[PDB]
Amino acid sequence: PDGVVSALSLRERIREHLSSEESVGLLFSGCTGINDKTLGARGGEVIMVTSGSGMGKSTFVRQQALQWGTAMGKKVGLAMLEESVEETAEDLIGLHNRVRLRQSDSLKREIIENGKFDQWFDELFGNDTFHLYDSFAEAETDRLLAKLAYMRSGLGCDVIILDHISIVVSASGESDERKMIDNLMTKLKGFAKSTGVVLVVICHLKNPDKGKAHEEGRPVSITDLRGSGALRQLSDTIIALERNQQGDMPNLVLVRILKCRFTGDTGIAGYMEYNKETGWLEPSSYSG
Amino acid sequence: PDGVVSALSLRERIREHLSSEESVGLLFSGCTGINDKTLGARGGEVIMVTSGSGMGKSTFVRQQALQWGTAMGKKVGLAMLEESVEETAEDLIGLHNRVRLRQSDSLKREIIENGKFDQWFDELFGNDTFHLYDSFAEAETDRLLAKLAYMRSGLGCDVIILDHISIVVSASGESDERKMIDNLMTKLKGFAKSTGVVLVVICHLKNPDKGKAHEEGRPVSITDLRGSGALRQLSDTIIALERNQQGDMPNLVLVRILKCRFTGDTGIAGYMEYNKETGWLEPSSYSG
Amino acid sequence: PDGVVSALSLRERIREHLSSEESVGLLFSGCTGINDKTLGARGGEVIMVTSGSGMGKSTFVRQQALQWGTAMGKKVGLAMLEESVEETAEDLIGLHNRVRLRQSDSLKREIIENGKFDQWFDELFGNDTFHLYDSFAEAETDRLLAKLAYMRSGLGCDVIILDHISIVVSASGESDERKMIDNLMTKLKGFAKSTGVVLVVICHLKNPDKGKAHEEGRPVSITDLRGSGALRQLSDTIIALERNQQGDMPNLVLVRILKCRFTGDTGIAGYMEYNKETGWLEPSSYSG
Amino acid sequence: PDGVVSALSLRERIREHLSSEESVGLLFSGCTGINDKTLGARGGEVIMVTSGSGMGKSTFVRQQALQWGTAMGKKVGLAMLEESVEETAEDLIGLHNRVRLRQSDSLKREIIENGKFDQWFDELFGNDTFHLYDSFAEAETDRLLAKLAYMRSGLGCDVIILDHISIVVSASGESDERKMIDNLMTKLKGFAKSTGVVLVVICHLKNPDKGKAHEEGRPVSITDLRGSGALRQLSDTIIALERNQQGDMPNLVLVRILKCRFTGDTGIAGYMEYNKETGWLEPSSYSG
Amino acid sequence: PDGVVSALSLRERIREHLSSEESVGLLFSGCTGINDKTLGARGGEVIMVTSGSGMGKSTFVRQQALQWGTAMGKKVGLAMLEESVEETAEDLIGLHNRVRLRQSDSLKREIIENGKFDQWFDELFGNDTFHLYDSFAEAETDRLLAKLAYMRSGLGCDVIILDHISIVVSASGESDERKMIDNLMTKLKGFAKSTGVVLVVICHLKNPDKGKAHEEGRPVSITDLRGSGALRQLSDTIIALERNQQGDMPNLVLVRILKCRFTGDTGIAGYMEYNKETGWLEPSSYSG
Amino acid sequence: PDGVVSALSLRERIREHLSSEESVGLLFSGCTGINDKTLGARGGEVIMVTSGSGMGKSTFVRQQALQWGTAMGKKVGLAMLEESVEETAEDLIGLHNRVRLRQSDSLKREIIENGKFDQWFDELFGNDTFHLYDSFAEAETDRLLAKLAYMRSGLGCDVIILDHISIVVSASGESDERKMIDNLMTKLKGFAKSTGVVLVVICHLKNPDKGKAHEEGRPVSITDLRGSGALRQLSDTIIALERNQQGDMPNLVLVRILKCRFTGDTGIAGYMEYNKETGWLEPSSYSG
């Protein structure tokens, strides 16, 4: 069984690798420190965001989409296989206007009658920056990658967002979807690198059930990452959010970097606080 | 291959969304706050009510049925797998009339001979809203789902109450029922999401026997949930009731949103008090 | 598949229901309050009576049988596994005559010679209200359920007393008898509910060995129960006795209703005192 | 399956039982309280002594042999299947003369040369009171019972001692020796009752391995008794010794009565202290 | 059927006993007290030496071999299953000459060229007392016992040291080696008791991983013994060594007699200190 | 069955033994003291290097390889599973040239253009002392052992570095990978001992979540080790690094020898400091 290369014959591969192996562009918002320990995200790179169920993997990664295609005018590609394009649209809108438009059947009625809908809608999607995959009808790997690709080549996006990488739906009949996740992650790291598009992906965590878990504290280690850690490899960076919803500061969320190929600088990035009012992830002043 | 819609083309689809789109719905009775945190029970959502043995599950749940099928007139399907329809209806009658009919032989005799029974009966069951699965003789999964599907689709029920999801009774010959519970959920959640009905399901908790427990106070945690954390994912809201029956305030019960997908707002909703006289779980005013 | 009845069509079923649908039946003797938090012993239920070793379990249950079988004329079946029929009968006689018949040779000599025995015998067992299970030799589960089953349906006993539910003796070759204590329960509960007889079962306690315990006071909690809490669920009313034989009032025994399905009314029911003369547990007035 | 006797037809059996169902004779030494909670041991009765491995089941029961055949001049029958008649003889001798003749190769040499051996030997076994079974070559049940019987009928002993009731050695080929112990215990309770000989037996405890065990504290409950508790029935009394050899008072031993058919009075008898000097079990002044 | 001997007829057999009957024998080196509590190692007795990983077992044991085979001239059989005979003999040489030969490349070279090696060698191995099983290539139970039996019976060894009883290597195809360990003991203990040889066996401890552990201080308990408590019964003496390698006094080691059949005297024997220079475990003077 | 050699007949075997029987080999670089408590890395041994995530494990092991492979001219095999060959090679180069080659685009651009890369490359890998395992794609146990096996016997490496022993990827269908981490070890240990190569394996830590931990200081104990302590036994020297990146001296890392078969010398070996410029772990002087 040979695949044991010697370090001298690695010469031409180290040269290739050494030329354009990513400097600074696109820096996450909501908390500096993520930036201090990563320096934003690179094209060709694969950002991995994870956390317990219902903790803000979705809220954080959507904020970046927002900021990115607003303040720093970038073409964000959205692919939320678990929600209607109108729903994700909704979050972006309420989010943009610092409000929780879903949690308010009065505010929804409000803006539609009083006309602020058309107002907000244009002011936001006005620059034709945001674009989205559309379905809820189980998407296949190649199928998906194609459209994800169309968002990068056809529409010309800088950043693509794939929410939840477990929803596989491909060539069924081959045991333990532990490889699907693996295979998919490679195609994703492939396409990402060869097009140079910033690719942000969200994956979930296995359920420990061997101690007190995630929704109650417990940091997440590289191991706890769902999917036979093929993604802990192909992904260049890994953001993790932890918060004890049953505690005193359920809105207090710690950001932890589990990997940053680029700066190799890991650990705790800092803290954030959910604003039940704006729905935003504001930077906090904490330390335990 | 095209199906990648653009922000703008969505403006009208998103408008048609933001109205006649109900985010609130069927508010829980017993404590404002279960509402302030969860915005009521959405249709197509799975409500998970849990607690220690004999602590309130059954009663809290039953009270919700009584209000929804009365004051807010909705068809309520009841599948109380551990008691006869006459018993559950007995409680329902007692409950509606703010009296504990079961616990009183005198009151029973009474209302029977003074003709009042028939009154309370019409006055409640009159608008044909209450419907119940009947047997006690162990029900199977597809068998029950079949009947439940009937209520939802056949009778047009809006809410289906299924008390006790540990009573399985299905294809025996496959180790640990841990897979039965999980596959059941996946079917209920599925049933729920596709019919758009409101599904309130009760579950019990694994015996911690590693410290002081549930009927003695002691917060329930998402790990405490009997059934290998499948439901901890498939259900949308987890309502847990905690109380220390062996104390000064046995009837004081704490409400904890163990999870609420739709809002993400978890934590201590509030408190309620058991009224040994009416049998209702009235909202309280307390702080520990 | 219609077996889903609507409330209305149950009118008649519910009338025939509340009338002659006893919810107060067989009150306990020697301590009102047990009767207050439980409204007695309903047929079809499972009454659990536990305590530290040699602290009330036995006597209290033996007294209830004695009262129920006389003054109240019910038929009582005794399943005393750790003793012979003449052993338990000996106790009964003496117990009825407020005399420690066993701990005294002088008296056994007398009554037998002076003829008072035949008197006492006829006076206690005269009304054929007492029947027992006879053997002492390790009884198997199905082997048992069947005899108790006989007592009920064959002999017509309204009450059955199973002393010690740790003496399992069934299908050997299946790890941890923890399973045995659970399966047996499930068979008894079914037995009781279906047959409608009153089942008063005795079980012991887990030796905590983590604090000062049982023999020295210490309240018994539901967790403390032997056999992984299957019974904690299958039984409908758990009565627990506590006392400190190594304290000041070694005769003052506390009576705790650890659980009572029917009423939900839990907590300390009251107190009782041991009278070394009569061998009884006399009614007491106290508050610590 | 019938063996369900009625309490009226039990008349002639209760009469038999009531005549000579044992007052006071032979009271254990080393600690009063055992006596206060049992009143010595009766002829026909079966004393059961148990404790962890190496705690004094053997030292206690040998002290009684001593006292009994010395101060109260009774014919003690000894059957120590795990030690040479000369070894058990040794303990009795050193014991009698308040010394640990085994633990002293100097004291052994001493008395043999200086002539105190013949002295002690006569002064003790002088009254031809002690008698012993002889072998180490595995003894069968009937085989054993016969000799044990010969000690009661042939030699005319008041008290018989059978050390360690696990060493069965009988009709091999019948699964789980759980019955051997059971069967044997019956023959033993039989012969004991029908001859009227005091029978003291020593049995060991199962190994809990579910918490901190025996040699480190932990009282022994009736359950922990090795052998499918057939012996917790046939034996009339059950003495148990507990001591934490890894503690501060490894010589401090608590006596606990797990049963006393006669006085039914159980619990903690009191305490004792090993005298590393005399090897005796002296009464102590303690309370925890 | 007669075999019931009488006290008196025994006088001569008992005399012949009390002399040329050795109760002391082969005292442990390293701390008087292992002796004061156990009176040395009797022949036909099973010595159990245990401790945390790399804490001293091997060394304590090895030192016993060196003294017994030297100063008290006895034939010592060594079966060190985890090291070559040259290694064990290397230590033995180093040890005898109060130097750590292994840990010194200079000293090794030395004694080799200055001819001293040959001296130390004769001076030690000379009286042909040291014998060792040889291989490293996994030994089977009857295979090893066979060889061990050889040393005892063939070579006439008095003491057999068998290091590490977890290295089984026998009839594989029967779940959990827990039965291998137990059946091995039963064979060694048997081998021991019948040949009258002294058997010192080493075992390791189950990983507690439930608190602070063994190499950090933390008393070993009879439950901590790896191998389902078979050895906790079959061996006659259990010598355990405890030390906290991560402290101020890493080399201070505590001696605990976990059990000593022959005497019953258990507890803390004493302390010893590891001398990084001589490599010996010298007796200390300490008190915590 | 003779395979029992006598000490004497081993004279010659023991001479050829102590001579050219290295006990000091391959000392560690950058912190004398590791070398003091371990006398380096003997061939055939298994060196365990662990720590909190991102706290020294990687760098320290990467530095040892770098030194061993140059200044000392040994052959080193790298089995870095979480990185590509050009990735780890990139690190090495930069590491050798005390420059953060990865975290800096400007420099990769330079050296490649200014030709300094070819220089650096030849200077580091010139002597063909470096070889790697190539894949990234989940390697199976037997699949691996074989390649490492190749490096040793085929390529002649004196040292092999296996980064991350949690990336098992072997025979799936056997509960708890706890078994996997143990079996793999056993195969590596065997591999090492038999082949004679130096095996330096990296493994991570159990997240205590019971106190303040790893990322914040806290000493690592042996128990803290991932994979139920099979390694804690199979490995011959465990090196643990501790540090507080959320404290005062985030660069001061402590080096603890958790275990060292060979010498037994355990405890804190010393300290080191992280230099953000060089990316190295410089030798340090300290005492807290």
mmCIF file of N, CA, C and O in Angstrom, chain B residues 199-223:
data_model
loop_
_atom_site.group_PDB
_atom_site.id
_atom_site.type_symbol
_atom_site.label_atom_id
_atom_site.label_comp_id
_atom_site.label_asym_id
_atom_site.label_seq_id
_atom_site.Cartn_x
_atom_site.Cartn_y
_atom_site.Cartn_z
ATOM 1 N N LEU B 199 -49.515 19.789 16.613
ATOM 2 C CA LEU B 199 -49.322 18.551 17.340
ATOM 3 C C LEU B 199 -48.637 18.713 18.698
ATOM 4 O O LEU B 199 -47.464 19.068 18.782
ATOM 5 N N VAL B 200 -49.380 18.440 19.763
ATOM 6 C CA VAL B 200 -48.833 18.535 21.108
ATOM 7 C C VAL B 200 -48.615 17.096 21.566
ATOM 8 O O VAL B 200 -49.553 16.308 21.625
ATOM 9 N N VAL B 201 -47.367 16.757 21.866
ATOM 10 C CA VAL B 201 -47.001 15.419 22.307
ATOM 11 C C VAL B 201 -46.322 15.448 23.669
ATOM 12 O O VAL B 201 -45.489 16.311 23.950
ATOM 13 N N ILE B 202 -46.663 14.480 24.507
ATOM 14 C CA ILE B 202 -46.068 14.380 25.826
ATOM 15 C C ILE B 202 -45.021 13.268 25.877
ATOM 16 O O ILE B 202 -45.187 12.219 25.250
ATOM 17 N N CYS B 203 -43.936 13.511 26.601
ATOM 18 C CA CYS B 203 -42.905 12.496 26.769
ATOM 19 C C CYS B 203 -42.547 12.522 28.244
ATOM 20 O O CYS B 203 -42.892 13.478 28.942
ATOM 21 N N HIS B 204 -41.870 11.481 28.722
ATOM 22 C CA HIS B 204 -41.461 11.429 30.125
ATOM 23 C C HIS B 204 -39.945 11.567 30.193
ATOM 24 O O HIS B 204 -39.300 11.577 29.150
ATOM 25 N N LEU B 205 -39.375 11.650 31.391
ATOM 26 C CA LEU B 205 -37.932 11.824 31.506
ATOM 27 C C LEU B 205 -37.141 10.628 32.019
ATOM 28 O O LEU B 205 -37.611 9.893 32.880
ATOM 29 N N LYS B 206 -35.933 10.434 31.496
ATOM 30 C CA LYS B 206 -35.085 9.334 31.954
ATOM 31 C C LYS B 206 -34.796 9.529 33.447
ATOM 32 O O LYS B 206 -34.548 10.647 33.898
ATOM 33 N N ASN B 207 -34.817 8.441 34.205
ATOM 34 C CA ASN B 207 -34.544 8.497 35.632
ATOM 35 C C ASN B 207 -33.084 8.892 35.861
ATOM 36 O O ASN B 207 -32.190 8.086 35.653
ATOM 37 N N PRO B 208 -32.824 10.133 36.317
ATOM 38 C CA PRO B 208 -31.446 10.588 36.550
ATOM 39 C C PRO B 208 -30.654 9.761 37.566
ATOM 40 O O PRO B 208 -29.466 9.476 37.355
ATOM 41 N N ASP B 209 -31.325 9.381 38.657
ATOM 42 C CA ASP B 209 -30.714 8.598 39.732
ATOM 43 C C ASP B 209 -29.215 8.826 39.766
ATOM 44 O O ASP B 209 -28.415 7.922 39.529
ATOM 45 N N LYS B 210 -28.868 10.074 40.053
ATOM 46 C CA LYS B 210 -27.499 10.537 40.129
ATOM 47 C C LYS B 210 -27.644 11.953 40.679
ATOM 48 O O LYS B 210 -27.278 12.926 40.029
ATOM 49 N N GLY B 211 -28.214 12.053 41.875
ATOM 50 C CA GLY B 211 -28.426 13.346 42.498
ATOM 51 C C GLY B 211 -29.870 13.460 42.952
ATOM 52 O O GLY B 211 -30.564 12.441 43.035
ATOM 53 N N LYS B 212 -30.330 14.674 43.257
ATOM 54 C CA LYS B 212 -31.717 14.871 43.698
ATOM 55 C C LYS B 212 -32.589 15.031 42.452
ATOM 56 O O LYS B 212 -32.130 15.595 41.462
ATOM 57 N N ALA B 213 -33.835 14.548 42.482
ATOM 58 C CA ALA B 213 -34.640 14.600 41.263
ATOM 59 C C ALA B 213 -36.039 15.206 41.122
ATOM 60 O O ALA B 213 -36.780 15.426 42.077
ATOM 61 N N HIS B 214 -36.337 15.428 39.844
ATOM 62 C CA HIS B 214 -37.542 15.987 39.268
ATOM 63 C C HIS B 214 -38.796 16.231 40.083
ATOM 64 O O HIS B 214 -39.455 17.256 39.875
ATOM 65 N N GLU B 215 -39.179 15.306 40.960
ATOM 66 C CA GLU B 215 -40.386 15.515 41.759
ATOM 67 C C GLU B 215 -39.988 16.228 43.040
ATOM 68 O O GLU B 215 -40.804 16.486 43.910
ATOM 69 N N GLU B 216 -38.716 16.576 43.131
ATOM 70 C CA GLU B 216 -38.205 17.248 44.311
ATOM 71 C C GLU B 216 -37.589 18.561 43.894
ATOM 72 O O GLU B 216 -36.765 19.128 44.607
ATOM 73 N N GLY B 217 -38.032 19.060 42.749
ATOM 74 C CA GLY B 217 -37.453 20.271 42.211
ATOM 75 C C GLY B 217 -36.412 19.667 41.293
ATOM 76 O O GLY B 217 -36.448 18.455 41.074
ATOM 77 N N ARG B 218 -35.481 20.458 40.785
ATOM 78 C CA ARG B 218 -34.449 19.949 39.893
ATOM 79 C C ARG B 218 -34.865 20.200 38.489
ATOM 80 O O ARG B 218 -35.749 19.541 37.953
ATOM 81 N N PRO B 219 -34.203 21.151 37.855
ATOM 82 C CA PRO B 219 -34.490 21.507 36.483
ATOM 83 C C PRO B 219 -34.273 20.339 35.539
ATOM 84 O O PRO B 219 -33.331 19.566 35.699
ATOM 85 N N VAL B 220 -35.169 20.211 34.572
ATOM 86 C CA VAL B 220 -35.054 19.181 33.560
ATOM 87 C C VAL B 220 -34.076 19.790 32.556
ATOM 88 O O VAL B 220 -33.947 21.010 32.501
ATOM 89 N N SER B 221 -33.351 18.974 31.800
ATOM 90 C CA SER B 221 -32.436 19.534 30.809
ATOM 91 C C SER B 221 -32.690 18.754 29.549
ATOM 92 O O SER B 221 -33.236 17.666 29.630
ATOM 93 N N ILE B 222 -32.299 19.285 28.393
ATOM 94 C CA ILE B 222 -32.571 18.579 27.152
ATOM 95 C C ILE B 222 -31.966 17.185 27.114
ATOM 96 O O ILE B 222 -32.382 16.350 26.320
ATOM 97 N N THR B 223 -31.004 16.912 27.982
ATOM 98 C CA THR B 223 -30.413 15.583 28.022
ATOM 99 C C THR B 223 -31.343 14.628 28.791
ATOM 100 O O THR B 223 -31.422 13.448 28.480
#
